[PDB]
Design a protein around this ligand. Structure first.
Ligand SMILES: CCc1cc(NC(=O)Nc2ccc(-c3cnc(Nc4cc(N5C=CN(CC)C=C5)ncn4)s3)cc2)no1
Ligand SMILES: CCc1cc(NC(=O)Nc2ccc(-c3cnc(Nc4cc(N5C=CN(CC)C=C5)ncn4)s3)cc2)no1
Lengths: 298, 298
């Protein structure tokens, strides 16, 4: 049974005075919200200031978005700390609109990182592959953690993975801080704009999100990861024929640089039967083995 | 008092049967020697084969080179294991010419790695700087280890630094496995071809090699490191005017992307007074501080 975010607690140990925040550049924004870099004085050590990210709503937000941001705060507090998630550091729930303070990741999102690597010899090939295997491993570990907490991400994709010091990757969710109106990867399906090319068939046709639909999305993520940031199903618009092709079982081919075993993981993530897809804990063990064998590769 | 390699022991615990080696590609070669990749069956685990590097002489070698390679074996056995040195794994001292078996580094030398990075946005700039700081730190730690064993390298330079899995750097010495006749970075000075642009003035003018002359060479290494592999003193040939300019105190300017504190380290490595140059253990602590402060940088 997946978590109901509205029925999680909020611990005032997270409370931080908003006047100790100094806001900087906007890191992302959508219609109703934004994430902004900031300096937080005294957040961790009383005499130290540190860089954080702050998610907040815009004045155009309604009750639904206000409740959504408080629910996000509650989820982040409930999840606790994991190396491969963006971690909560504090919050401002009094003295003004809700502010949610998290870690700042210094290299931006993985999608942009990948697309520069492709807008660019076997040694470089090999080193890039070492990084990509690491990224696949870290994301699977962060997702296994989310699943262990009965949490569903619902929008896993390279654009929702951040890179920071040490080439550590952290899963995030820009959510309301993304301009999905102007992001072609989000397409109108009924009443909402959804990332359909990342979504499992049961999510598309039944609006059902599960542990297993997150795994499907992880498979698409692996494909963009080893395609250096290409959009999935290249050349195909999301329309009537795309839905039928997915129902009949058509799938993307392997990326040209994906290792054979990473392609096999992709394929199993895209099984039409959710019960046949691997779990994230199973994926972690499979990638661990590939990394372990990669020290045997020259 | 620096080690006399000829008066070090050889422990037959290192002995490995040469028929268990399967030779592959040549990794480097000079007039008298070469380093070759190989598979070694049973070197560490009795049923496992692993990739190694093997240094060996060519049939043109004389007694002087044969003694040199045995001395190299002895030095490597005496140094023992350090993460940031190429480590000895075994040797073949019977049944044929001397073979010296070491770790294989899978990404090649740092000089070539750097020159591809320059034959190629703030996020990429920042990530490259994180790597370069790491490389400077790891090389200083390997050199501090060599100095602690009263060992002098005598040819420290990016071409003698290897990169391997995990972006770990290992100091090496291709030595006789380098074609210094055809490497313009080695210039005739008297009877030998020496890497003069990397050499301290006391080494050039008195043929004296010390702990402090290694530090000078490390300073030049930092310059090529932050110049993405450019040759030092660009545009200046090594001739009469170069020697006088170095004697009078002229030095290279900062690389454009070197952090201020890494430039200050460079400058102190190039002090005309060897007793005023930092030790490698002092350099390790200074770079540790820069890396620690780099998590404060966005
Ligand atoms: C997973 C479970 C979950 C999470 C969640 N909420 C949730 O993640 N909010 C949320 C909070 C925080 C963030 C961010 C944290 N750091 C960020 N850094 C950057 C840097 C960047 N750069 C671009 C360019 N340059 C060169 C100048 C540098 C930097 N560009 C964009 N962003 S963005 C994202 C989303 N809810 O559930
Ligand atoms: C420090 C104290 C000391 C050391 C010492 N002796 C001492 O280091 N010998 C010595 C032993 C071993 C080595 C080497 C170990 N691994 C190496 N790998 C590569 C890889 C490479 N690639 C190029 C291209 N590609 C794409 C196909 C892949 C790989 N190219 C060149 N080399 S070279 C060097 C020198 N004596 O004292």
């Amino acid at each position: 049974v997946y978590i109901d975010p509205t029925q999680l607690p909020y611990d005032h140990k997270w409370e931080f005075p908003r006047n100790r925040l100094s806001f900087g550049k906007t890191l992302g924004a959508g219609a109703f919200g934004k994430v902004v870099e900031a300096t937080a004085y005294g957040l961790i050590k009383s005499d130290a200031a540190m860089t954080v990210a702050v998610k907040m709503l815009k004045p155009s937000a309604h009750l639904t978005e206000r409740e959504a941001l408080m629910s996000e705060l509650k989820v982040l507090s409930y999840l606790g700390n994991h190396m491969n998630i963006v971690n909560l550091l504090g919050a401002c729930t009094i003295g003004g609109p809700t502010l949610v303070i998290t870690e700042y990741c210094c290299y931006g999102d993985l999608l942009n990182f990948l697309r520069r690597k492709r807008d660019s010899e076997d040694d470089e090939l090999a080193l890039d592959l070492e990084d990509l295997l690491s990224f696949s491993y870290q994301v699977a570990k962060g997702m296994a953690f989310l699943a262990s907490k009965n949490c569903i991400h619902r929008d896993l994709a390279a654009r929702n993975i951040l890179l920071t010091h040490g080439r550590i990757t952290k899963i995030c969710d820009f959510g309301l801080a993304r301009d999905i109106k102007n992001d072609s990867n989000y397409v109108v399906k009924g009443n909402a704009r959804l990332p359909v090319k990342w979504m499992a068939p049961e999510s598309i046709f039944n609006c059902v999100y599960t542990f297993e639909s997150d795994v499907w999305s992880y498979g698409i993520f692996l494909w963009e990861l080893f395609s250096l940031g290409s959009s999935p199903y290249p050349g195909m618009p999301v329309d009537s024929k795309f839905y039928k092709m997915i129902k009949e079982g058509f799938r993307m081919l392997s990326p040209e640089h994906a290792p054979a075993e990473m392609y096999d993981i992709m394929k199993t993530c895209w099984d039409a039967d959710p019960l046949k897809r691997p779990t994230f804990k199973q994926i972690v063990q499979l990638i661990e083995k590939q990394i372990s064998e990669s020290t045997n590769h020259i």
